[PDB]
Ligand SMILES: O=C(O)c1ccccc1O
């Protein structure tokens with residue numbers, strides 16, 4: 001298998017967060033390393049497991065607990081939930097006190113586990129004033145920029161939003177779980193030249 | 208009556224991801240001064256069984272190019288817009304107006320989400336498809352960090368140009384206009400609060 005020569009198409013399951021986290025650097029990497037490969041990505045919900053066997057999908061990335069049968073996996077990284085708001089929010093502060101967190105208004109994302117973030121808050125007596133609720137993360141960044149709403153966001157998602165949308169963060173005041181993002185491949189392809197190649201490239205660019 | 212300034216009702220809205228970061232930002236800013244205690248929730252048109260949910264009253268309004276919704280559904284057109292071509296502000300060699308000849312030549316990111324790609328292929332135009340993603344969240348970053356170009360809806364481009372440092376070109380191929388509509392179920396045509404939300408949209412969106 002020669003990367004610089006290959007015209008193969010690799011297919012990857014990953015979340016939306018995982019999409020705008022992973023792809024940008026990856027594409028930049030590939031531009032110089034494998035200039036003729038093609039990449040396609042899809043969501044873990046449109047389905048998988050079978051597809052990984054069939055060779056329809058090559059790798060998958062996320063907090064996929066479902067996968068644990070004929071599935072090798074390597075941890076890339078963990079990261080924490082953070083609290084994100086516009087740089088000049090009228091009254092938000094870092095580190096945010098849990099007391100203040102209760103008090104402000106939030107946008108919540110329904111969405112990988114995650115999470116069940118909102119479960120832990122509610123059980124700890126903390127009832128957020130939930131002004132908006134969205135299914136996934138695309139609009140989050142703009143929304144914070146144009147309003148005084150705060151959000152509970154995964155750390156590496158925050159990172160890629162701070163500049164474009166002019167927002168900052170705070171360590172999260174509540175006790176929430178760490179986020180363990182993993183790389184998964186089907187055993188049947190453990191010894192596939194090209195697949196191992198992609199695997200290592202990920203491990204390389206992320207860790 | 209209804210009273211917006213007093214109401215604590217929750218409105219539920221079906222819309223795409225593009226529609227989410229297009230509509231929500233301005234809407235939330237609008238509501239902040241007009242209805243400060245209302246709550247909004249949004250979901251994807253694939254999410255529930257929308258059609259049924261709109262009858263039920265589980266979803267109040269829906270926004271998009273939803274052709275499925277015919278029959279017991281009133282609808283008003285908000286706007287149309289065209290497909291554009293989008294690339295980073297200093298792309299090494301991309302130009303505006305992009306010639307169809309150059310379009311064929313550069314490398315693209317394609318979004319899976321109404322067959323644009325069908326019409327290209329039928330017109331003999333085989334793009335060099337370096338990446339393919341399911342929806343739009345990562346598009347903006349991706350163009351920023353690479354020399355890839357994309358075929359994007361106009362009003363989506365608008366909200367990306369600043370944050371990610373990209374510009375556009377009128378699209379060199381013949382592609383359909385995009386007709387975005389507002390839909391509500393007949394059963395609720397005469398609902399005070401629903402009519403209120405309807406009008407607010409009609410108001411904030413048009414030209
Ligand atoms: O939550 C995920 O699945 C995830 C995936 C990739 C990068 C960051 C993430 O939070």
Ligand SMILES: O=C(O)c1ccccc1O
Nearest residue numbers: 223226229270271360362
């Ligand atoms: O589908 C939508 O709701 C939409 C909204 C704004 C711009 C383009 C779109 O497709």
